[PDB]
């Protein structure tokens, strides 16, 4: 059985009466979900998986880019020198689950070994018609509204000895993060339970200690555009940029408040360029989410120091899709 490239079709449960854009997109782009999805185990079968070279990631990226280009339309966008201007109405924008399904002649293998690290053989493979429901959430640093590990935290990285490789963390227990723009109009903030978060970092350190038996440190982002130096995401059609310094500042041998700002001028994640949106809506803007994963970068430095330091990273949304699709691969059939 050999990996193959094709166009997977999406399944969803959009609602015809919704003006919310994910629903609107899914009405014409997807088909209804299967109520009784079939999953078949492959006895005495081992298969090679690679979450870092998976064409499923690449197609999903293309689709969400297409979703965004239709849904979130800025008043102005600078790509190169060409300043395109257009109507920029406020929109309802809240991700819904999307299943990716194999067309006829193809199949999707599913690694079921719970202790799978993202790359290498899997002695526990099954065939599925569709992936599980995936919310295409665009965010940086913190992965929101995603899937969870079963028993213990998972550190996935192509090689964690290489500091140039992104570290994808999957939590077992979700950490609630609530963001509010109270009734300065651009001023907002997030709330996080400090006990739940310290307990989360504890679990992450335990898994990181299996690679580095040193003092594990968490520090904040040390450079880059605002989209990646902050926890950036979208709520109520508005773009939030949240300072995560209070989340990543601890050594390892109550309530956390993250100050946020709503921005009109942003850097585009689909492609290189800036985009300007209209001023924020009045009233209250409110997002209740679950932190289910992290994107980390480990500080390099060729000294035998007594510590390893990890900072929040990301920016390449393909990594977000990767944290959900890591267990899947497409295959051609005879």
């Amino acid at each position, epitope marked *: 059985w050999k990996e193959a490239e094709t166009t997977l079709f999406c399944a969803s449960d959009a609602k015809a009466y919704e003006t919310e854009k994910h629903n609107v997109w899914a009405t014409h782009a997807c088909v209804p979900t299967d109520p009784n999805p079939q999953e078949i185990h492959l006895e005495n079968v081992t298969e090679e998986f690679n979450m870092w070279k998976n064409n499923m990631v690449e197609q999903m990226h293309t689709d969400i880019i297409s979703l965004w280009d239709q849904s979130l339309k800025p008043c102005v966008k600078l790509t190169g020198g060409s300043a395109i201007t257009q109507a920029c109405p406020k929109v309802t924008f809240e991700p819904i689950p999307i299943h990716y399904c194999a067309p006829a002649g193809f199949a999707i293998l599913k690694c079921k070994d719970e202790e799978f690290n993202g790359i290498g053989p899997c002695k526990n493979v099954s065939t599925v018609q569709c992936t599980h429901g995936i919310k295409p959430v665009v965010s940086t640093q913190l992965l929101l509204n995603g899937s969870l590990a079963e028993k213990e935290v998972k550190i996935r990285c192509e090689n964690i000895t290489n500091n*140039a490789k992104t570290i994808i963390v999957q939590l077992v227990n979700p950490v609630k993060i609530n963001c509010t723009r109270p009734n300065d109009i651009r001023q907002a903030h997030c709330n996080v339970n400090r006990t739940e978060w310290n307990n989360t970092l504890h679990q992450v350190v335990e898994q990181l200690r299996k690679h580095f038996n040193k003092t594990i440190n968490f520090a904040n982002s040390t*450079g880059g555009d605002l989209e990646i130096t902050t926890h950036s995401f979208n709520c109520g059609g508005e773009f939030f940029y949240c300072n995560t310094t209070n989340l990543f500042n601890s050594t390892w041998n109550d309530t956390i408040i993250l100050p946020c700002r709503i921005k009109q001028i942003i850097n585009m994640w689909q492609r290189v360029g800036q985009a300007m949106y209209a001023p924020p809506i009045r009233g209250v803007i409110r997002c209740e989410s679950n932190i289910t994963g992290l994107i980390l970068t480990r500080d390099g430095g060729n000294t*035998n120091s007594t510590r390893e330091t990890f900072r929040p990273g990301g920016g390449d949304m393909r990594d977000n899709w990767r944290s959900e699709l890591y267990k899947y691969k497409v295959v051609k059939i005879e």
Partner: antibody
Framework: QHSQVQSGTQIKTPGASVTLSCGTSGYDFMESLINWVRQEIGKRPEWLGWMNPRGGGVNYAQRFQGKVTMTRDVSSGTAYLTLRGLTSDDTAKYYC?????????????????????????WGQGTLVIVSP | YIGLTQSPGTLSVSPGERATLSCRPSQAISKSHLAWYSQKSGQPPRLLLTGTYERASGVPDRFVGSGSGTNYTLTIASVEAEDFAVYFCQCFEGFGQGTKLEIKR
């Protein structure tokens, strides 16, 4: 073909800051990570950090945290290295450098996908001299 | 943390003679993650071997890389006048302290 054009020698007083530049050409600037390497005279090369021109994310070597700042101009394909709080210890040659290409035109290729550490393309180096 | 120790510090040979450089990583590493560079005065380092043995542009086959785990060697079959330089081994962000290839007298 790739060209890494670095700025000229700079003589600075202690405590001052300096900004070095690395003009790139011969490839898509967005596709490869930019690294900076320091070499003190008669000593080995020392890695300072890398920077992803897509987003501008960085990774500074531990003992240079607070010393270096890596930025870029996307339009001109120019990378920048700023050193602050200069001391005589900072007197050295500073190289701009990048690894091999892993994507000449794949759809969404990015520096983080390539192997960073096979440094085939070096700038000519910029000498910084710290003295009062 | 992967430190790299090279030996000898200075290797004196005559032209036409054989030269054996050595690099010792602090820990066991992969053959795919070790590279060699040469450096002449006034120039940046030049990449010679990208893999453990994979030569590069304009790098003649008298240069032969070898080794595994914790013992990597660079061997120059027949040293010529253009080969005298400082040689650095590398693993990720770390470089060895260097081996100076010197004219023997």
């Amino acid at each position: 073909q790739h060209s890494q054009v670095q700025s000229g020698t700079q003589i600075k007083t202690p405590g001052a800051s300096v900004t070095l530049s690395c003009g790139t050409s011969g490839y898509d600037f967005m596709e490869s990570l930019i690294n900076w390497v320091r070499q003190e005279i008669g000593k080995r090369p020392e890695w300072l950090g890398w920077m992803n021109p897509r987003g501008g994310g960085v990774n500074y070597a531990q003992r240079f945290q607070g010393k270096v700042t890596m930025t870029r101009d996307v339009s001109s394909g120019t990378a920048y290295l700023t050193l602050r709080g200069l001391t005589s210890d900072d007197t050295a040659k500073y190289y701009c450098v990048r690894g091999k290409s892993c994507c000449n035109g794949r759809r969404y290729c990015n520096g983080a996908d390539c192997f960073n550490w096979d440094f085939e393309y070096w700038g000519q180096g910029t000498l910084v001299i710290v003295s009062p | 943390y992967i430190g790299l120790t090279q030996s000898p510090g200075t290797l004196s040979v005559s032209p036409g003679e054989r030269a054996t450089l050595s690099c010792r990583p602090s820990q066991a590493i992969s053959k795919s993650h070790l590279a060699w560079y040469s450096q002449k005065s006034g120039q940046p380092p030049r990449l010679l071997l990208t893999g453990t043995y994979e030569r590069a542009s304009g790098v003649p086959d008298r240069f032969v890389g070898s080794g595994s785990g914790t013992n990597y060697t660079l061997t120059i079959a027949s040293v010529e006048a253009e080969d005298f330089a400082v040689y650095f081994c590398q693993c990720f962000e770390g470089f060895g302290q260097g081996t100076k290839l010197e004219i023997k007298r």
